[PDB]
């Protein structure tokens, strides 16, 4: 059948791709630069697909082949093709190339291919052994470049334990590996390990532990924008649970801004959900466009109903949407925040009143916010003013709420501070861009 | 004799703390920023049609930054010193 | 209709007059330059696709 022949063709182009990747790994090893490693792991997700049993069998029978225990470990875990007519001997290593032991980069990359393919076959137990052997091999290695590769497999390791639904037999190991990376002053490995540990903490709901670590540990700035986005999302969740709502909103906005354009639909959906919830907690109505995006329409539709209910001020609609779709929030891990918003809706009305009016009396505020008594209105407006949501003061002598008069900000030092932040960022960008300049010898 | 020949073009101490005419500084900023606008148009056209605006833009930026930074710092020093 | 510059204060009954500050040409040209290098950044986004 010609279909099998075309499958063989795409398989051998994948073989060429992985040959190029291992060549780049060796060039990084012999070129004293880790950026080639980063490029190899950047091409890694693209070739994580398009592979089958024979692709990996020919890979492991083309590389390694030094009669080491590696062959005895990875060959039995995957099937083998029959005596095919096209017995094209794929041997990237010839003689002395096959004689020397494989570099940690190439062996780690091929073992990574084994574990991701095994995961794609959805038999997690088989991949568990290969991952454990991989990280037994790479634990002793202190290669700086390998850490990059190590970083990636680190993530994959946690990933497989997600399908094993344990996430706890390895928590101590991730802690120790993160500590090792910290003493190695590594950037990528430390960042990815922090992200994985935070994900584990939130999966097991240990928010206090995550808050303690993020207070103690420092996320490396010089990390991947993807890892930065994951860390920002986790930190935003932490601050939202810790009631630090404004900082959580800012952090989640930064995470959304650093999202991979249109690559991670699920991560963007979760970030949008949490950001909408926390923004509602602040009393700010979110952007409407979020609900009309092609990928986030149905996902945020219950949140559209929630936002409509709170903006309209109909607490009955709030309870109704809690009854029908609120259970979904439990699957989304936001139910507690939604209850907090159920009991914090009135903040949005107070903010609206402050935005529109400037000297509205307490009785008018109570009338427009469905508050039973003017004294309750006084309490609510005073609390909102104290909690940094309103910029007014209540003249209790005659009961009117005078907002702080708007002063010409350009005549103040605020524009200077904003321009200072912008100038510092621009100068830092110029320094970073000129600092590398990558002039080869 | 080297130092006392240097005394010829040496600026006085009052020149360091003096401030350029503010009404003139604004006009200079307006002019150079408008030239930078024309230069940015030329730079966009050149970069887009690639697959000397850059040098001129860099020189204008150097001029603007040095002028404004020096004027601002002189202003701060004068505000603190004379009270 | 952008005739004689001033604003009526109906609250007490007044028509104030002022001198209509010019526009600060520097800021308008700065906005134009910001737009221009936004275009330049889009052009660089068209580049950098060659790794």
């Amino acid at each position: 059948a010609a279909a099998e022949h075309s499958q063989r063709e795409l398989d051998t182009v994948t073989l060429e791709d992985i040959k190029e990747h291992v060549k780049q790994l060796e060039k990084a090893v012999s070129g004293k630069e880790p950026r080639f490693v980063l490029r190899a792991l950047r091409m890694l997700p693209s070739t994580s697909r398009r592979l089958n049993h024979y692709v990996l069998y020919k890979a492991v029978q083309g590389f390694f082949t030094s009669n080491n225990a590696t062959r005895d470990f990875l060959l039995p875990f995957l099937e083998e093709p029959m005596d095919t007519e096209a017995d094209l001997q794929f041997r990237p290593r010839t003689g002395k190339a096959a004689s020397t032991p494989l570099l940690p980069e190439v062996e780690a990359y091929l073992q990574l291919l084994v574990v991701i393919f095994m995961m794609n076959s959805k038999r997690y137990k088989e991949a568990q052994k290969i991952s454990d052997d991989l990280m037994q091999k790479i634990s002793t290695q202190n290669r700086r470049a390998l850490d990059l590769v190590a970083a990636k497999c680190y993530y994959y390791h946690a990933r497989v334990y997600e399908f094993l639904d344990k996430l706890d037999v390895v928590r101590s190991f991730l802690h120790a590996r993160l500590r090792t990376a910290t003493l190695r002053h590594d950037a990528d490995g430390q960042a990815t390990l922090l992200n994985l540990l935070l994900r584990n903490y939130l999966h097991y709901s240990l928010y206090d532990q995550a808050e303690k670590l993020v207070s103690k540990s420092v996320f490396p700035e010089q990390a991947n924008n993807n890892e930065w986005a994951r860390y920002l999302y986790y930190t935003g969740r932490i601050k939202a649970i810790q009631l630090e709502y404004s900082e959580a909103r800012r952090t989640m906005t930064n995470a959304l801004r650093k999202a991979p354009q249109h690559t991670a639909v699920g991560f963007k959906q979760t970030v949008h959900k949490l950001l909408i919830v926390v923004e509602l907690l602040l009393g700010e109505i979110p952007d409407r466009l979020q609900f009309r995006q092609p990928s986030l329409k149905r996902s945020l539709m219950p949140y559209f109903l929630l936002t409509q209910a709170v903006r309209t001020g109909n607490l009955a609609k709030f309870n109704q949407v809690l009854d029908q779709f609120g259970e979904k929030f439990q699957a989304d891990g936001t139910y507690t925040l939604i209850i907090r918003l159920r009991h914090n809706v009135i903040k949005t009305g107070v903010r609206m009143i402050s935005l529109s009016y400037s000297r509205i009396s307490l009785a008018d505020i109570a009338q427009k916010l469905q508050l039973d008594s003017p004294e309750d209105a006084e309490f609510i407006v005073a609390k909102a003013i104290r909690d940094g949501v309103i910029e007014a003061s209540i003249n209790h002598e005659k009961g009117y709420v005078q907002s702080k008069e708007m002063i010409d900000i350009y005549s103040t030092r605020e524009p200077q501070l904003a321009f200072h932040q912008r100038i510092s960022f621009c100068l830092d960008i110029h320094n970073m861009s000129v600092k590398a300049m990558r002039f080869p010898p | 004799e080297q130092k006392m020949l240097l005394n010829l073009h040496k600026k006085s101490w009052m020149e360091g703390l003096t401030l350029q005419d503010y009404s003139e500084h604004c006009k200079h900023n307006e002019s150079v920023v408008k030239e930078m606008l024309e230069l940015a148009k030329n730079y966009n056209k050149a970069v887009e049609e690639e697959d000397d605006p850059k040098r001129h833009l860099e020189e204008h930026v150097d001029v603007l930054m040095t002028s404004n930074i020096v004027q601002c710092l002189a202003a701060m020093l004068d505000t603190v010193v004379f009270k | 209709d952008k005739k004689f510059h001033g604003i009526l204060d109906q609250g007490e009954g007044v028509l104030i007059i002022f001198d209509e500050p010019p526009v600060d040409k520097t800021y308008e040209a700065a906005l134009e330059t910001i737009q221009n290098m936004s275009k330049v950044v889009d052009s660089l986004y068209n580049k950098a696709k060659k790794l």
């Binding site: 110029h430 990558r438 | 860099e58 930026v61 | 290098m37 950044v41 950098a48 060659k50």
Partner: peptide, 30 residues
């Protein structure tokens, strides 16, 4: 701030051009 932004964009363009040039040389070597 405008001048600093201009300089940063120019530096970014220069870095992109330099990376393109060194990759072009590396691929043309083979």
């Amino acid at each position: 701030y405008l001048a600093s932004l201009i300089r940063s964009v120019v530096a970014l363009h220069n870095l992109i051009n330099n990376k393109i040039a060194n990759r072009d040389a590396e691929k043309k070597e083979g």
